Scaffold this active site. Structure first.
Site, PDB file in Angstrom:
ATOM      1  CE  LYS A  45     -21.276  11.225 -37.317  1.00 22.74           C
ATOM      2  NZ  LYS A  45     -21.583  11.878 -35.997  1.00 22.74           N
ATOM      3  CB  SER A  46     -25.421   9.249 -37.955  1.00 19.03           C
ATOM      4  OG  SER A  46     -26.047   8.584 -36.875  1.00 19.03           O
ATOM      5  CG  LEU A  73     -25.174  14.471 -38.684  1.00 16.78           C
ATOM      6  CD1 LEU A  73     -26.380  14.499 -39.612  1.00 16.78           C
ATOM      7  CD2 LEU A  73     -25.072  13.117 -37.992  1.00 16.78           C
ATOM      8  CB  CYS A 132     -28.813  14.626 -35.736  1.00 15.26           C
ATOM      9  SG  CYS A 132     -27.435  15.806 -35.802  1.00 15.26           S
TER      10      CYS A 132
HETATM   11  C1  LIG Z   1     -18.847  12.657 -30.365  1.00 15.35           C
HETATM   12  C2  LIG Z   1     -20.156  12.170 -30.449  1.00 15.35           C
HETATM   13  C3  LIG Z   1     -20.728  11.934 -31.700  1.00 15.35           C
HETATM   14  C4  LIG Z   1     -22.034  11.444 -31.800  1.00 15.35           C
HETATM   15  N1  LIG Z   1     -22.581  11.218 -33.008  1.00 15.35           N
HETATM   16  C5  LIG Z   1     -23.757  10.560 -33.105  1.00 15.35           C
HETATM   17  C6  LIG Z   1     -24.223  10.111 -34.344  1.00 15.35           C
HETATM   18  O1  LIG Z   1     -23.576  10.305 -35.377  1.00 15.35           O
HETATM   19  N2  LIG Z   1     -25.438   9.423 -34.429  1.00 15.35           N
HETATM   20  C7  LIG Z   1     -26.186   9.178 -33.266  1.00 15.35           C
HETATM   21  O2  LIG Z   1     -27.256   8.574 -33.330  1.00 15.35           O
HETATM   22  N3  LIG Z   1     -25.718   9.627 -32.029  1.00 15.35           N
HETATM   23  C8  LIG Z   1     -24.499  10.312 -31.948  1.00 15.35           C
HETATM   24  N4  LIG Z   1     -24.034  10.706 -30.747  1.00 15.35           N
HETATM   25  C9  LIG Z   1     -24.848  10.433 -29.531  1.00 15.35           C
HETATM   26  C10 LIG Z   1     -24.440   9.064 -28.927  1.00 15.35           C
HETATM   27  O3  LIG Z   1     -24.687   8.022 -29.885  1.00 15.35           O
HETATM   28  C11 LIG Z   1     -25.226   8.766 -27.647  1.00 15.35           C
HETATM   29  O4  LIG Z   1     -26.613   8.707 -28.003  1.00 15.35           O
HETATM   30  C12 LIG Z   1     -25.012   9.856 -26.566  1.00 15.35           C
HETATM   31  O5  LIG Z   1     -23.657  10.347 -26.570  1.00 15.35           O
HETATM   32  C13 LIG Z   1     -25.370   9.320 -25.152  1.00 15.35           C
HETATM   33  O6  LIG Z   1     -24.491   8.234 -24.751  1.00 15.35           O
HETATM   34  P1  LIG Z   1     -23.247   8.435 -23.746  1.00 15.35           P
HETATM   35  O7  LIG Z   1     -23.889   8.984 -22.531  1.00 15.35           O
HETATM   36  O8  LIG Z   1     -22.757   7.062 -23.619  1.00 15.35           O
HETATM   37  O9  LIG Z   1     -22.361   9.394 -24.447  1.00 15.35           O
HETATM   38  C14 LIG Z   1     -22.773  11.183 -30.642  1.00 15.35           C
HETATM   39  C15 LIG Z   1     -22.188  11.400 -29.387  1.00 15.35           C
HETATM   40  C16 LIG Z   1     -20.884  11.894 -29.284  1.00 15.35           C
HETATM   41  C17 LIG Z   1     -20.314  12.119 -28.020  1.00 15.35           C
HETATM   42  O1  LIG Z   2     -22.971  14.350 -35.437  1.00 14.16           O
HETATM   43  C1  LIG Z   2     -23.424  14.935 -34.420  1.00 14.16           C
HETATM   44  O2  LIG Z   2     -23.174  16.136 -34.180  1.00 14.16           O
HETATM   45  C2  LIG Z   2     -24.341  14.230 -33.457  1.00 14.16           C
HETATM   46  C3  LIG Z   2     -25.379  13.447 -33.949  1.00 14.16           C
HETATM   47  C4  LIG Z   2     -26.240  12.835 -33.037  1.00 14.16           C
HETATM   48  O3  LIG Z   2     -27.181  12.115 -33.457  1.00 14.16           O
HETATM   49  N1  LIG Z   2     -26.050  13.015 -31.716  1.00 14.16           N
HETATM   50  C5  LIG Z   2     -25.050  13.793 -31.258  1.00 14.16           C
HETATM   51  O4  LIG Z   2     -24.897  13.946 -30.016  1.00 14.16           O
HETATM   52  N2  LIG Z   2     -24.206  14.398 -32.122  1.00 14.16           N
END
Ligand SMILES: Cc1cc2nc3c(=O)[nH]c(=O)nc-3n(C[C@H](O)[C@H](O)[C@H](O)COP(=O)(O)O)c2cc1C
Ligand SMILES: O=C(O)c1cc(=O)[nH]c(=O)[nH]1
Ligand SMILES: Cc1cc2nc3c(=O)[nH]c(=O)nc-3n(C[C@H](O)[C@H](O)[C@H](O)COP(=O)(O)O)c2cc1C
Ligand SMILES: O=C(O)c1cc(=O)[nH]c(=O)[nH]1
Ligand code: NI
Lengths: 313, 313
Positions: A45-46, A73, A132
């Site tokens: 997780k970021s 986050l 983000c």
């Molecule tokens: C619940 C959730 C949490 C996410 N948290 C992060 C994150 O912490 N760091 C990040 O780079 N992307 C985060 N994302 C974005 C995903 O890594 C991804 O870039 C985005 O959802 C597109 O992919 P998908 O179409 O497969 O969902 C998050 C997405 C979701 C749905």
């Molecule tokens: O933690 C989140 O809210 C989050 C981070 C991120 O990089 N991308 C995203 O869709 N959500």
């Protein structure tokens, strides 16, 4: 006769599949489960320097065409993910990426200084999140090309290793050119992950006449079926403009066929978010099987044979 | 007991529906067909000073979840649409919007100077397109705020009438704020149309292992189901930030329910693009009927009763 193997960043991956950062990778149990899964890799997780509770709930909603989220986050803090990488992860099973999302340049600088030793000793690889879009009063770093340049400059200055960058999607060639110009100035940036969610969409429930998530008046990042053509565009755009770098695909992958499209567009690794959120880590068995099936029917033996070879008219 | 009536810009519209600019509105025949349809209004194809052939074909592709296009502004030229507005259009049937998309500020200025007399005499209403994403080498003006301010100044200088602007989608609050602040400087801008297509997506056909449109290596604007939450977000964002203006919704409308969502978000008029392309002008009888049905089930009699009233958590 067939192989999903990938070789990059001085590592061997059994297959290109991994979780998208932020999906099922926050807790020890989630990280262990990703490691035990059929995925070729995983990313944590970021993280921010200290633990964050994140935004008030509801902050995620599954949808027929994907998902919307404004998580904010929530994470266990950098020490926690650093300790997982340093002491707990079984590198014998698969390589590990650590996603970093400091809220300022100074936060990224401080965390990278400490990550350096662990990367050196254990081989954890940094994915730096510049996209983000869910932390209130904090614009996406990579939509401001000056803030992007400064962040990369600082990290490159203090961090003695190769790393990657997680990018927001762009929507015009001028933007593709500007982002690529900046990224090409940094030889330590060895992979580019395209894309983070499509920022600040708004889902409205016709039955309740209301939005579906609480933070930011219901505005949140879109993932899933909604984002596939945007993901492929960004994957291919940077694949073409950054020939000295690897592209990791992320966005709209539910099937082996979707993954096949990512690779055709230029992707080396393929990240899975929304679909994994809805199915759990068993999805990686289905995805490898499906991708191998697609390749069988098309008579491909390796990923190298079609990566980036999408035909234009 | 119920009415889809809308009142704005000194006009009465039977219902909020109209075509999206560029869809089924290029030729005389199409303009007459739109005028004879059940739509509340219509807008003519975005025009340049002289006729344009547009991009090489194929340049449009219908998709399960919407459409991708890179038309490149094929149009009959300004004189042609001016003449339709001045001489041929039956204003007795419904009001008319004229979409203008000069390739430079000076081109828009020169067209507006000539449109002025026809607006005065016949009542045609300008929708100024600041967001065309498909003419190669020409970036979207509305992604460059200083350029946008300059253009609106130049046009306001020579055009003694109210008008609207067709906007590209934005993806973060800082961008919503910046755009709204520009638009709020110009009182003549009485409506904002959100949104033009999601720019430069890339559709890849897994069977052919190729892109599906010829221009720009397969990159093109997305419409349809892909874009609804982005459209709703932009509608609502500008609805909130520009309380002195009206919002026209455009993007992802296939049903009366979709239109209901547009209005909830803040839309006065509702434009239909991809769905109209696939179904033809008969769609407007179905849409008016469906929206009335949605309103009856929810016990609304007018659009005023719920416009912009989406509930946040
Ligand atoms: C619940 C959730 C949490 C996410 N948290 C992060 C994150 O912490 N760091 C990040 O780079 N992307 C985060 N994302 C974005 C995903 O890594 C991804 O870039 C985005 O959802 C597109 O992919 P998908 O179409 O497969 O969902 C998050 C997405 C979701 C749905
Ligand atoms: O933690 C989140 O809210 C989050 C981070 C991120 O990089 N991308 C995203 O869709 N959500
Ligand atoms: C074939 C086609 C041509 C278009 N041409 C124009 C145009 O000339 N001017 C304009 O402002 N938008 C143009 N667009 C964008 C649409 O007006 C609309 O903003 C977009 O398609 C989103 O609506 P939809 O989801 O209903 O398709 C065009 C769209 C399509 C599909
Ligand atoms: O003519 C086009 O290519 C076109 C113009 C525009 O404004 N929007 C769009 O999707 N296509
Ligand atoms: Ni942008």
């Amino acid at each position: 006769s067939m192989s999903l193997q990938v070789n990059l960043l001085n590592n061997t991956f059994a297959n290109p599949f991994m979780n998208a950062a932020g999906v099922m990778c926050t807790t020890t149990e989630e990280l262990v489960a990703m490691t035990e899964s059929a995925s070729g890799s995983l990313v944590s997780k970021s993280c921010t320097p200290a633990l964050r509770e994140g935004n008030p709930t509801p902050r995620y909603q599954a949808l027929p065409l994907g998902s919307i989220n404004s998580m904010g986050l929530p994470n266990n803090g950098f020490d926690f993910y650093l300790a997982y990488a340093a002491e707990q992860h079984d590198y014998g099973k698969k390589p590990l990426f650590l996603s970093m999302s400091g809220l300022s340049m100074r936060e990224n600088v401080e965390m990278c200084k400490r990550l350096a030793a662990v990367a050196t000793e254990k081989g954890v690889i940094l994915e730096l999140n510049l996209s983000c879009p869910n932390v209130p009063g904090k614009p996406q770093v990579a939509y401001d090309f000056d803030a992007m340049r400064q962040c990369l400059t600082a990290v490159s200055e203090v961090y003695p290793h190769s790393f990657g960058v997680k990018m927001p999607p762009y929507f015009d060639f001028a933007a593709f050119d500007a982002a690529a110009e900046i990224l090409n100035e940094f030889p330590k940036v060895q992979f580019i992950t395209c894309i983070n969610s499509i920022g600040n969409g708004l889902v409205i429930d016709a039955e309740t006449e209301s939005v579906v998530i609480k933070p930011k008046q219901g505005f949140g990042g879109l993932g899933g079926r909604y984002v596939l053509p945007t993901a492929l565009a960004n994957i291919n755009a940077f694949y073409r403009r950054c020939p000295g770098k690897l592209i990791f695909g992320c966005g709209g992958v539910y099937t082996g066929e979707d993954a096949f499209l990512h690779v055709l567009a230029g992707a080396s690794m393929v990240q899975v978010g929304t679909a994994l959120q809805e199915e759990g880590p068993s999805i990686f068995e289905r995805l490898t099987s499906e991708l191998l099936g697609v390749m069988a029917k098309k008579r491909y033996q390796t990923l190298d044979e079609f990566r980036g070879k999408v035909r234009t008219l």
